[PDB]
Ligand SMILES: *[C@](=O)([C]([N]C(=O)[C]1[C][C][C]N1C(=O)[C]([N]C(=O)C1=[C][C]=C(C(=O)N2[C][C]O[C][C]2)[C]=[C]1)[C]([C])[C])[C]([C])[C])C(F)(F)C(F)(F)F
């Protein structure tokens with residue numbers, strides 16, 4: 001996250017860190033004790049058998065006992081278009097179930113087809129690059145962003161941090177977009193480079209997939 005701040009320890013218990021060989025590579029949201037939601041391009045060309053789903057984390061550099069680690073067991077995708085970046089959502093079923101607690105909580109989703117309006121205040125988070133060039137975050141960052149509709153496909157939910165050079169950057173993909181306490185986006189792609197100050201970042205619109213997500217997570 002470029003231009004944000006450190007989230008209070010365990011402020012967002014549904015936040016998940018996807019990792020390959022000790023290193024975080026994508027964000028995800030816990031949506032059921034045994035289901036995580038992320039961006040389809042995260043598991044795209046990656047050895048899924050080796051991806052570890054870390055829950056209950058805050059500061060990735062330290063050994064935290066709050067953490068619960070699961071492995072992916074099943075992959076569900078619904079028309080992910082790799083070239084046009086459409087339907088960039090993947091449901092990953094875990095090999096076990098998170099013990100729900102103060103650190104590990106389940107996220108809530110909007111209703112099927114709940115379109116966000118231009119100007120809505122939302123909060124983004126992730127452990128991605130701290131700067132266009134500056135290293136990956138170690139402590140979960142958060143960022144106040146505003147929904148916009150200009151310079152944005154209806155097949156995406158875009159945000160813009162008006163009047164500043166801030167936004168999601170590499171490593172935030174998969175991370176949630178919580179608007180009104182509901183996950184309305186799944187960090188997908190940026191334009192003009194991270195934090196251009198000119199282009200909106202695009203999130204996968206969770207709302208347009210609520211029915212599918214449910215038929216799976218039951
Ligand atoms: C992750 O955290 C990051 N995401 C990415 O790197 C995504 C995944 C694949 C490519 N990508 C991008 O962000 C790229 N953005 C685009 O491909 C892109 C830019 C511009 C346009 C465009 O002009 N459009 C006009 C019409 O509307 C549609 C948009 C389209 C597509 C970028 C690198 C070039 C972060 C969220 C940034 C991750 F990918 F998982 C990572 F961690 F692995 F990086």
Ligand SMILES: *[C@@H]1O[C@H](CO[C@@H]2O[C@@H](C)[C@@H](O)[C@@H](O)[C@@H]2O)[C@@H](O[C@@H]2O[C@H](CO)[C@@H](O)[C@H](O)[C@H]2NC(C)=O)[C@H](O)[C@H]1NC(C)=O
Nearest residue numbers: 021048049050051052053068069070071072094095096097
């Ligand atoms: C669910 O999977 C976890 C994580 O499995 C590890 O990571 C995978 C990507 C893969 O590399 C596995 O071989 C790894 O074991 C399991 O947690 C581990 O379980 C083993 C055996 O009990 C233990 O030695 C490890 O320390 C555990 N923790 C970690 C972080 O690896 C977990 O037991 C699996 N099953 C259930 C029901 O949760």
Ligand SMILES: *[C@@H]1O[C@H](CO[C@@H]2O[C@@H](C)[C@@H](O)[C@@H](O)[C@@H]2O)[C@@H](O[C@@H]2O[C@H](CO)[C@@H](O)[C@H](O)[C@H]2NC(C)=O)[C@H](O)[C@H]1NC(C)=O
Nearest residue numbers: 011120121122123124142143144145177178179180181182
């Ligand atoms: C920056 O964002 C915080 C948090 O945003 C809210 O909570 C998110 C989870 C999501 O639901 C967003 O849509 C919400 O806007 C804002 O903090 C809130 O501030 C109000 C008073 O201004 C307070 O009543 C709430 O309790 C706060 N919410 C939390 C979760 O602490 C904050 O106002 C935003 N800052 C700016 C400048 O807009």
